[PDB]
């Protein structure tokens, strides 16, 4: 995956070199976010598309295969800022809010599926929190293979190979890193 290296290099070069005259808005967005322990980043697409048209050309193409390479891309940056050596640092969530063109709810029919869509509605009720997973260890029922699975997002079945079978993999919940989820429903 040299291509992912090529994309992530462009995201680092987008965070470190970005200049609104003259402060670096993102780079400081980052620091001021890790200190309060927010562990998040908010990108402004207009700055993004200003910087390179290209990376927004791909990011509006296949978002769910890219955006996580942007997450890892930014957390690899907070490693060089928030700490220094020669932990643990979760991969930050990015929140991008931008103008574009409002696409009303009725007008969502297929055709834009997996393409970023800005819209507007009144939230009805919020669903009770429940955790998905981020990083969970797994051991085999037999050969006892110790596998650390980095689950991303971007549902995902567990790998069957180290009889053995068909799916001899247990979730270790003593070491598994979890995040949260909501489920809004909007009228």
């Amino acid at each position: 995956d040299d291509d992912n290296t090529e994309i992530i290099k462009s995201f680092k070069n987008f965070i470190l070199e970005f200049r609104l005259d003259s402060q670096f808005i993102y780079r400081d967005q980052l620091r001021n976010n890790i200190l309060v322990k927010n562990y998040s980043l908010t990108v402004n697409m207009e700055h993004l598309i200003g910087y390179n048209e290209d990376i927004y050309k791909k990011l509006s193409d296949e978002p769910s295969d890219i955006i996580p390479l942007f997450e890892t891309a930014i957390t690899q940056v907070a490693k060089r800022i928030s700490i220094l050596s020669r932990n643990s640092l979760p991969t930050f969530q990015l929140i991008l809010n931008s103008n574009a063109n409002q696409i009303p709810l009725r007008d969502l029919d297929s055709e834009h599926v997996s393409k970023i869509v800005r819209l507007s509605g009144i939230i009805i009720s919020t669903s009770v929190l429940s955790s998905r997973a981020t990083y969970l260890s797994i051991m085999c029922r037999n050969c006892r293979h110790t596998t650390s699975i980095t689950i991303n997002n971007f549902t995902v079945s567990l790998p069957r190979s180290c009889n053995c079978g068909p799916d001899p993999y247990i979730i270790i919940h003593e070491s598994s890193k979890f995040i949260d989820q909501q489920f809004l429903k909007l009228q």
Binding site: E17, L20, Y51, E53, A100, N101
Partner: protein, 553 residues
């Protein structure tokens, strides 16, 4: 009538002192050219750190309140865009003080013809007539040296016959249309290049200046491109990008469009509100609106993709933006759209088309802000002037966008109401000329400003004539909300469809002064421009009848 550099050294010698200085440069008035000029002028002063006063004058009548009130130590004065028509020597008077007169008022104007009393009989000027109309201009030359100071009965009769002989041809002059030769900015730059400053934002000020008026003719501007493009060639930020780079990062040539707000608005709304395209495609008509969509069907551009803001459209459509138009627009007669334009890129913020910037400033001038009410309103425009002045600065872009969110809205007003007219076919073809009046409309608050009616008047004189046989006929407009029937009425000039043989020299300036000199019925030349006047509904109708006859054209 002087070298620009030498007029400069004069305004240098009378300037710097203890206490400094003193000079008031008058920026006037509502014309974007003024800004364009006086900003590079003011920056030039700041270079030598010469103290200055700068005054936002609206009314021509308003100038008297200023010059007659506050002057003390000011030995060198500068003025912009005024005096080319009406002379200030009689208007201000002057009253010579102390040859080698103490105060020098520089008058910069693009308007023609100059007042006769101005150029000859040097008192207050120090004229800026150079170099556009020099000329000769032998008609003004014989106007004085003959006139001044001017068997014996036949020599008296001969003399008087000669006097009227000169007075006739002289009467031909100074009674004429007011038409800008070259943008005052251009000349300030010609003055600026002799001193040796090549500054980039300066040059951008020139580009702004030139492109201030392309909404209305060129007229010479069609040949101004050498004088700009060469200068764009006299400098360059880098031989090759080197993307971006974050600094310099400057202006460049791109296939720009008379199309309206291409970069800061959605494409479809960018055709639909554009001024040149309103006309040829009959967009006020529901039957013609479709013809646009047929354009998009020809381009293969989705309707949904046309509705989306221009920043975010796909890259393929961007790379094909200079091709597809060639492939298609030719068929609709829309082939004159693509100019060679100037675009300055600030990089990570965006880019801005030379013209669109001007649309932002104009947008700023009217919005985003019995004699007490009009004075207070003109005052609000005076304050608003600086809100518009600030947007020129590079360091604050944050409010420039406040202009653009307005510039869109205005069109959404202007277009709308514009259509509200063509549905009722309110155009009166009359006989000698075309004429109109808006008796009722939404939100006349926007139409208070002279320049708003300059642009509505512009999209309308542009709409009625494609051309559109026959006989381009100048248009008239009127509007009223408050201030007790002020009914502002602006003069207009015909638009040729890119094939322009003659300047055609707006005649309303003369036709109005003929009426002020007749019954003068509530006629007010208070606005700085000779084309635009005020009227009352009581006296507007007899005024309109006296406008119809006698026709000077």
């Amino acid at each position: 009538i002087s070298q620009f550099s030498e007029a400069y050294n004069k305004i240098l010698r009378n300037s710097s002192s203890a206490s400094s200085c003193q000079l008031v440069i008058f920026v006037s008035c509502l014309n974007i050219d003024a800004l364009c000029a006086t900003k590079m002028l003011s920056l030039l002063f700041k270079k030598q750190l010469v103290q200055s006063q700068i005054v936002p004058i609206f009314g021509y009548s308003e100038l008297r309140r200023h010059y007659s009130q506050l002057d003390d130590n000011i030995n060198s004065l500068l003025l912009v865009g005024f005096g080319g028509v009406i002379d200030l020597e009689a208007f201000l008077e002057i009253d010579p003080q102390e040859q080698s007169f103490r105060r020098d008022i520089y008058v910069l104007d693009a308007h023609r013809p100059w007042n006769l009393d101005n150029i000859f009989g040097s008192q207050i000027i120090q004229c800026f007539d150079d170099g556009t109309v020099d000329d000769t201009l032998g008609e003004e030359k014989e106007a004085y040296y003959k006139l001044l100071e001017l068997n014996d009965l036949s020599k008296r009769k001969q003399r008087k016959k000669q006097i009227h002989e000169y007075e006739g041809v002289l009467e031909e002059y100074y009674s004429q249309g007011t038409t800008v030769v070259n943008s005052i900015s251009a000349q300030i730059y010609s003055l600026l290049s002799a001193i040796g400053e090549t500054n980039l934002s300066n040059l951008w000020l020139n580009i702004l200046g030139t492109t201030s008026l392309d909404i209305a003719y060129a007229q010479v501007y069609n040949r101004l491109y050498p004088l700009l493009q060469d200068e764009v060639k006299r400098l360059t930020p880098s031989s090759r990008n080197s993307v971006k780079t974050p600094d310099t990062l400057t202006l460049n040539i791109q296939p720009d469009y008379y199309l309206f707000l291409l970069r800061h608005s959605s494409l479809y709304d960018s055709f639909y509100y554009s001024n040149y395209v309103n006309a040829k495609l009959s967009l006020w008509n529901e039957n013609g609106k479709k013809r646009l969509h047929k354009m998009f069907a020809r381009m293969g551009i989705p309707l949904s993709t046309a509705q989306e803001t221009w920043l975010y459209m796909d890259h393929s459509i961007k790379r094909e933006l200079g091709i597809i138009f060639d492939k298609n627009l030719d068929r609709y007669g829309l082939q004159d759209i693509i100019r060679d334009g100037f675009v300055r890129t600030l990089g990570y913020r965006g880019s801005i088309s030379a013209s669109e910037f001007v649309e932002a400033l104009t947008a700023l001038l009217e919005v985003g802000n019995s004699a007490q009410k009009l004075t207070n309103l003109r005052k609000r425009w005076v304050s608003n002037f600086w809100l518009s002045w600030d947007a020129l600065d590079d360091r604050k872009v944050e409010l420039l966008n406040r202009g653009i969110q307005l510039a869109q809205d205005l069109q959404r007003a202007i277009f709308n109401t514009g259509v509200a007219i063509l549905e009722k076919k309110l155009i009166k073809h009359l006989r000698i000329y075309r004429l109109c009046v808006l008796q009722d409309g939404p939100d006349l608050d926007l139409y208070r400003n002279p320049l708003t009616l300059l642009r509505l008047g512009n999209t309308l004189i542009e709409c009625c004539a494609e051309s559109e046989d026959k006989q381009l006929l100048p248009m008239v407009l009127a509007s009223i909300d408050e201030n007790t029937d002020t009914y502002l009425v602006a003069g207009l000039t015909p638009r040729y469809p890119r094939g322009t043989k003659k300047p055609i020299l707006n005649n309303f300036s003369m036709a109005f002064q003929q009426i002020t000199a007749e019954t003068d019925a509530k006629v007010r030349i208070d606005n700085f421009e000779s084309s635009i006047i005020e009227i009352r509904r009581e006296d507007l109708s007899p005024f309109l009848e006296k406008l119809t006859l006698s026709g000077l054209l």
